[PDB]
Structures are given as C-alpha cells and as structure tokens.
Design an enzyme around this catalytic site. Sequence first.
Site, mmCIF file in Angstrom:
data_model
loop_
_atom_site.group_PDB
_atom_site.id
_atom_site.type_symbol
_atom_site.label_atom_id
_atom_site.label_comp_id
_atom_site.label_asym_id
_atom_site.label_seq_id
_atom_site.Cartn_x
_atom_site.Cartn_y
_atom_site.Cartn_z
ATOM 1 N N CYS A 105 20.024 -8.234 -38.824
ATOM 2 C CA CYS A 105 18.930 -7.285 -38.040
ATOM 3 C C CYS A 105 17.849 -8.547 -37.618
ATOM 4 C CB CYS A 105 18.320 -6.956 -39.525
ATOM 5 S SG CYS A 105 16.427 -6.077 -38.855
ATOM 6 N N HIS A 125 19.816 -6.377 -34.864
ATOM 7 C CA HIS A 125 19.614 -4.374 -35.315
ATOM 8 C C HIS A 125 19.753 -4.193 -33.558
ATOM 9 C CE1 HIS A 125 16.716 -1.809 -35.735
ATOM 10 N NE2 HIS A 125 16.375 -1.552 -36.790
#
Lengths: 187, 187
Positions: A105, A125
């Site tokens: 992420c 992400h």
Amino acid sequence: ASKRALVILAKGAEEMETVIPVDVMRRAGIKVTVAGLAGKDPVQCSRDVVICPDASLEDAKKEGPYDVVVLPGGNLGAQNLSESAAVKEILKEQENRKGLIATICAGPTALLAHEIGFGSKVTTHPLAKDKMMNGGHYTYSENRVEKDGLILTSRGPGTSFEFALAIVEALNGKEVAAQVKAPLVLK
Amino acid sequence: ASKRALVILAKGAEEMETVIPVDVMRRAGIKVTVAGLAGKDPVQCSRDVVICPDASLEDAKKEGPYDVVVLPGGNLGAQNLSESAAVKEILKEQENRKGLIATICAGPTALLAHEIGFGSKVTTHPLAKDKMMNGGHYTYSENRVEKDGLILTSRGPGTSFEFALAIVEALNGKEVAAQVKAPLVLK
C-alpha cells in the site's frame, strides 16, 4: 526449523494490511513477531482498531535476524516507519544480508525514505505512486503483487491475501502456499 | 444520522473476519463498536493477534440498539458466542426489532445455538456446514455472501471484504458501497 517474520506496527498502520499477513503467515507455520515501533504499548491503527504488539521493536531487533521484514501500509503508519532511524537500520541490515523485505500500500514509500532497493520494480497503492516515484528510483508496476528479487510489494487492502501468500511462497514454497490458501475461501 | 454496528469479539475469533468488517464499515461512515464478550480486556484471536475492544459487551448493550449485529467467525470464537446468554438476548432482541444480523465463517453456527433466523438460506465456511445444518433448520447456500432478509451470512476470510461491503450496502446503500470499494484494490 521454521522461518521467522518481523511485522513492524506503527500508529496509523492499516489494520487489514497488518492482520491479514500476520494471520496468513502464522497459518503457514511462520513464527511471526508483531513489533511495536513505539514500544510495547497497544497501537491505534488507521481505522481505530487497537492491536497489542507481541514485543517492542527494540526488543524484537535483539532476536533477529528474520527471514522477512514486513511493513504494512496506511499513510500515516508508513510515514511513521519512514521517519524512524530504527526502521532504517533494520531495513539496511536486511538488504545487506540478502533477506526479503515485503511491504504493501503506502508501505513501500518507507523503502524510498530509507534508500532501500533502488532500481527495483515495485507497486504501491495508486494514491502512493507519486510519493514512491519521486526521483525515479524505482520502476512502477500495476501488478497486484510485484516481486523483484528480495523486494516484494503490493497495492492495498484488497491485495493483502495475495501479498501474504506471496510471502508464504517465497519462504515456505508453492505447495505450502496452496495448502494455506484453500481454507481461506478466496476467489 | 449515522448507522451503528455492534461487533462482538470473543476469544478465538478469526482476526481477519473481525478487522476487515470493522475497518470497511468505518470507511463507510458507520459508527462501529467493537465489544468484548468477556469484558473490557484485550482479546486473543485465533491466530494470536490481540485486539483491544472499544467496550465490554455489557456496556455496549446499554448503548443500543444497533442497525447491525456482526458476529465474526473462527471456531472457537463462534463456540464462545454460541455459549453466551448475553449474545442470545442481543440476537433475540435484534431479530424481534427486525434489525440486521451479519455473520461469517463459523459465526452463523451461533445463530443455530440461539435459535435465530430458522428457515433462512445461509452459507458458512465449508467446514462449519455440518454443524450449521444439524436439524435442518436452515437451507444451505454456496454463495460467497448470502442474504435472506435480515440474515446475512458469508463463508471465510477470503469472503470478508464481500461480506463487509454487503453490510455497507444494506445499511448505507449501493453507491456508498461502491465508493468504499474502489480504494480497496479488490479484484
């Protein structure tokens, strides 16, 4: 003997990205230590889940090295990891010893902060791509899980199972990963 | 005004099945209370993640009612939920008031124990089907998420995002569910 994982837990970590890898790695028979960046005390995650770490990072470092160092995402958790001199040294030592580093992420942006793994293909992400790519030190990927040697990255809460199973495969092999996967009811 | 969720956390709960719904519901703007079955103290989940509940169940009941009551899975967590008179009364009251009950993995077997929702179509983890079906009080489904009116069920860790987003849709609608889903990087 079993493989060992260090999961570094900071305030603001994404709790799903923390718990899914911890749980899946334990299902794989990996000895996981959830280590609190700040100390031994409970950690308030990004969506207010409060997790009690197994140990402080200070103490967990005493018991290394580990076969994988895992950094969850969450912005703010990643920012705390990125600001930590202790994390810098753990990652540098893990890179030096040719050990796996796995992060998800916003977590890969801590690699950038600590100058780890430059030249690797990475994913993050989508919202963390600009930060990760500042200076062009990595090559970006949209794969849900990316692995370039000893740098394993992934994108978000919804790639956390895939990420965790990639760690399992890297440490314990494909057969163990497949065995762990089946009872999870993944699509 | 915001919708409210009660998540009942017992020793041996599946931590992924606890955290994914809590986190996703909070992303949806639902006010979530993580309530400890046993009291206020930290809870040791099935894969040894330790979660600090927001409140004891005793105290959380004082602040109801809730738009959804959520029971995570894990066998052993489900067994503790199934043995609890407090859970019996919460579920009975929620059924009486025509409120949603959502449970996952082995969690639906607590519905059986407390005689909730008989005649519903349900799913469970595959390994919990025989227990859930003892006496033929439900009709079984292999759908990853099943909803029969106010009884919402799902299968396992790997259906937890789908389960959580089904709760979000039921409480806050399809548009909110879609908005919450996109940043998760689900497949």
